[PDB]
Amino acid sequence: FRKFTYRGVDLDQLLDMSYEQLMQLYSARQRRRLSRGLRRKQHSLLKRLRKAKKEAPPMEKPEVVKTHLRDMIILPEMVGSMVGVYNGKTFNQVEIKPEMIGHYLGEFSITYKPVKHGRP
Amino acid sequence: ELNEFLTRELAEDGYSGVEVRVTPTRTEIIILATRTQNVLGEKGRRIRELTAVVQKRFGFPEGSVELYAEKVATRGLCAIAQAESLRYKLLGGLAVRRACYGVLRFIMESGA
């Protein structure tokens, strides 16, 4: 029932932000990630990945576009999206919640299995 | 690297070693072998090809490298030449004890 927020600003305001102050709203590692340079060297995948986020169906649940990139900064442009991220074997489908901004897709997809021991 | 290159190439003529002597604006590398008539080839073809490959590999100015080949006396007192001779005698097909006795008798006939 409560209204969701991230450093006090709202979701509509978070969509209506630019990257220059998104550095200061983000944390230290995420500001360095945005401030490294132009995203072209290894990040044409990141560019066209946000184009794939921008590509939208009609009023249903969005289609699950799947990735191989585990080091993505969660952006306000992809709130309420579905993505199946690679963990080595399968693609872990996940809802991008509006509490996750400032994280990585490699955190919500566990790579190893939970270990259940037996006998020596 | 130079000594390795010549001990791979000149395994037939009894290679021993190199001697690189430095001169103002000149480098020359003395080659001591056994068959000094065979290292040169016909009208010095092979020595010219060796100068050319050294100049093109080691990054030297053109015309600054001149190789010289000379023969050494007392072939039985060189360990590398007798080892190469025993290798050639075993590779052509011979008894190993026969070749070892022959090369040892040659070495002690050379005055060791």
């Binding site: - | 290159f5 009208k43 090809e49 050319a52 490959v53 093109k56 590999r57």
Partner: protein, 96 residues
Amino acid sequence: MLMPKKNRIAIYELLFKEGVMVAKKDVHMPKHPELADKNVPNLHVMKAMQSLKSRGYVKEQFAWRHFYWYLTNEGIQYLRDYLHLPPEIVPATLRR
């Protein structure tokens, strides 16, 4: 080996200008240092002179990481009737 015709020719008049050829065994290198005026990698040189070795016109030697090739008289004659040469030009390794 897919290879442009101009690179084959240019390698051949380099091989006939001076009767030796050297190359380092690496395939991920963009341009040959001696042919910096044009554009050809080391892979073309390695595979072309490997083909010419297999047809039997050069020697072969590997010291540390570099190649060493030496022309023979059948290789000389093959380059003389491949490059359309009148009988008056010889590589410098044969003359004094």
